[PDB]
Design a protein around this ligand. Sequence first.
Ligand SMILES: [Cl-]
Ligand SMILES: [Cl-]
Ligand SMILES: [Cl-]
Ligand SMILES: [Cl-]
Lengths: 292, 292, 292, 292
Amino acid sequence: GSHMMEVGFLGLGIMGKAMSMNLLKNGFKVTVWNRTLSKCDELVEHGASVCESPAEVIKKCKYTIAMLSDPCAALSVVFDKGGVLEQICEGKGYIDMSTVDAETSLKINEAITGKGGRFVEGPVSGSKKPAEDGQLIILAAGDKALFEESIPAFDVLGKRSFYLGQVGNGAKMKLIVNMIMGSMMNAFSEGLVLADKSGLSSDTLLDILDLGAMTNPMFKGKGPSMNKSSYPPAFPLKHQQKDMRLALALGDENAVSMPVAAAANEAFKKARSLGLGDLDFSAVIEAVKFSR
Amino acid sequence: GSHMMEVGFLGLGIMGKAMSMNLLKNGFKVTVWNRTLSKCDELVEHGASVCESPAEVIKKCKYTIAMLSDPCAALSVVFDKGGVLEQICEGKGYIDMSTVDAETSLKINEAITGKGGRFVEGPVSGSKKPAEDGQLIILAAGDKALFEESIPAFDVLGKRSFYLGQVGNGAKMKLIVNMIMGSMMNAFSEGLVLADKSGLSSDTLLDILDLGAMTNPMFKGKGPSMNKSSYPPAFPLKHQQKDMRLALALGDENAVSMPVAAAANEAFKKARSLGLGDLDFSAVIEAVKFSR
Amino acid sequence: GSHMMEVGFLGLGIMGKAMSMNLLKNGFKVTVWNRTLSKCDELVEHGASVCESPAEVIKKCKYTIAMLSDPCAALSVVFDKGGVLEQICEGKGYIDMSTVDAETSLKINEAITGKGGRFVEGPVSGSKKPAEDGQLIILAAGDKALFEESIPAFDVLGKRSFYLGQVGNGAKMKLIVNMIMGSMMNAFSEGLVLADKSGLSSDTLLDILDLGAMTNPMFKGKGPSMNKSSYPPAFPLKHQQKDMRLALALGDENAVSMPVAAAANEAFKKARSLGLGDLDFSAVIEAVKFSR
Amino acid sequence: GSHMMEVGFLGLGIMGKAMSMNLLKNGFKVTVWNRTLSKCDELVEHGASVCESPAEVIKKCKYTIAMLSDPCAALSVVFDKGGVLEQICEGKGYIDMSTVDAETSLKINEAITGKGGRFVEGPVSGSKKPAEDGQLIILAAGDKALFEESIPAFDVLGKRSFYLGQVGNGAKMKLIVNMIMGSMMNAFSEGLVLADKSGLSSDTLLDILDLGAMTNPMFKGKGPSMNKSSYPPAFPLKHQQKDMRLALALGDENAVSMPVAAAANEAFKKARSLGLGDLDFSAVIEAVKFSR
Ligand SMILES: [Cl-]
Ligand SMILES: [Cl-]
Ligand SMILES: [Cl-]
Ligand SMILES: [Cl-]
């Protein structure tokens, strides 16, 4: 019956389900919504309440978190009928942790605060595993008071939170992080393929990389699977590619030339054309491997 | 007067001086040669013997290590007058740890074994600091017996040794490692600049990167200096760029398309054109920053 | 005005001030009480509310945490006039994280639940630094529902929480942990002194210990200070000694013979007799050093 | 046929076999001796030469390492017929890494240098696993020149070497380290048993210890086995007990009172009386557990 804290939560995709389940397992009362109903099953079994629409979650909860798959979903959840905006009022807090561009979060911000609500964007660095382990890095921006009030939730969701100032700053920081990631994954893939094609062991290359100055969790975690041509989706390739595009648009906006990000972006497009959009972004190595 | 092991050592550049000093500090008798004489001062003060030419070092020592700045130097030391080849004979071992392409090490191998000697290529992963700390990763190939006999030295120089089979394999593995490194440094630089140009803190970006899935010693170690526009040479940019070229030539040879490495290579060329060839390879960020 | 969670908090000693400040810095609304008023200054400056008695904190807050210096304080806060018990009623939760023996927590439990409240004991492993960093280990027992509801707070206070079953189990686990600690500190001290008296460097001994199978944060953190005869109190010696006594009483109760704990206990008594009770428990080394 | 370095090696017990095999696997030529012949099988299969006596090993090798099971063995190998001393002469180096008391190493030193040889004591911190992994900590004393010349071998055997000055200092440092270890193991055992007898999980206690300020490799590595009453010998209990005695004798010599070491010593004696001398020293927990 009683709890210390309660939150609404919208979106039960890979990250959403992991994050909401983490909150539930950590003593939060959670009320969830998802467009795909079956996704709610596991949360219900762990005590989650369920509402039929984002509007109902907002009406019910003072603080609501959203984790949607892409900018179009994030906007839809806010502006469509039965959406967040129709139940926003004084006292309501909305924290969108979806990965979007600044123009998207700014649009949501204007609408939410226009109706008397408070808004924080809280995009995260870290994939499915970190999400389950509460090891995400929160890149927050927007209403500073709402940010601070949300720290208890952010402390369960992640291992560190950054407040980056005005709305848009979080979005921009997140895109930059994912851009480096996309570029790195490409650099990595090129080396793995070059090793293999040159008569070497890509597995040995991986051991060498994991011992030296470039060693990182991504190489460690993705490498062995990539070498087996196995790409179960933790971060779908189509989303990574979209993020590269959004990062390059920020580059466009600020007149920053980024040839490596641009080349990596095109490689992800090629991977999509190979029908790999729904696989892990590490599947981009298939674009490098393709031959005949 | 007495020692457990003795070695000859050619080349006292950044890596050479660090590696030879490590051997001396670790109880090896070392006899060194360098074209720049003053470089020998510090080694002499720590008990190193000195010879006037590579030929003399070879004549004196059963096992000789070489660490030269580039493929042209590595070849010169072997084939020029007063060079290694003229004192090579049965019982002599030559271990070239210079970073070169396979065609270079193969050429040296044929010449050395042709005169009855044994040859190992032992290029290393890891820069100046690892070299001083004996934390290098040895990527050896060539004479397996000589490799094994050299393990005691490799155990002082590095924290791990790989035997990769026939001559050329070490060279190829090393180029692939440096190619990823060059590409990564570019990806990194693009993000740091995009953060700055977008009104964010590149320092905060760095903190975020150091906490997440991409965290690595290179970002950690180079990042803060790059953000201060400080590029003291640990691995000169001109050498990194040459390595990118050599990696891309291996790609050419094996018909592997590598757009990200190729783009990074061109960025390093631009950095050279900005007069940054003698600075650390992390100076490539200046090529991304350049505006007016 | 608004917050996600609010808690009452009793006790602003070394651990209490560190823990309550951690909650405040992490977005919790906190209402504090301490017998020493000046201790409240720093919390007030960070937004804490203040009440005149534990009774008032309980009346005001649904969930209240207590961190008191010793079993006598823990009982007093509950049973004395103006104490916790007089405002306990249905819906009230009390979480005592003080270090006490099972008989103490059991007494508090009976009284609290007798008045319709719920009770958890949540003693912690980890000193002042972990407390500031939210790196404590929570050893909880008692009302399982209240435990679960308290996880959001425990997640800020510590890095891991254990539920150990019925009331008393947490107390017992905590005493056992502190007993090993006390014994270890004694073993450590004996070695440091023996090194010094035998003509060796206690600093070198410390380096050796920190590299081997016994390496631990306590040796690392306390060692250098001990070698300088510096004992600023993180965990006062008088409290450690009392804990040894309580652990030995549990041993007495269960007919477990513990000669090493018993010897360490007597060494702590000797340290107290040297007037060192208010210093860090690492001051026990002075009992080993004493000579003439 | 050819090698960089060669060494003699006496003693193929738990540590001796691990250390000599490490040298062989690392390119050293090794000539071994052991009183138990079958122990030599595995070394022979990896290329080791074998001699019939320590005298023959010394005659053959300029540098000889010894790792014997106890002070009596260490002395016997040196002074008995067919022993080390009869082939010691100018140019010969003897490095005894056995765990002994200062009086033992001093006796060996006088005899060896008296015959024109050089002597180093190099007792090690770290058990069987570290020995196989070359992760030992070398506590050297004696001839400084011989120490330095031996660094290449010590760099393979261990991860760090300390030079502690005159003969005896290494012995004393080693005894102090093992004394803390013995005392710690006792403290640990008492807690594990108290947890179990008090109705708690000793496994949970172990998890708690491994997360906090006392966390160390010994607890981590021994704990799970101890909780299963499994004591395969890595460091035989009879040797640990003897070491406690030797440490207490050093305490006696320097008038240092060490009640915790003294109590732990007596617990090890009780374990021996239970017939546990040949098991791992972690078997001392059986002395705490014993009841009826
Ligand atoms: Cl509903
Ligand atoms: Cl010369
Ligand atoms: Cl009040
Ligand atoms: Cl023989």
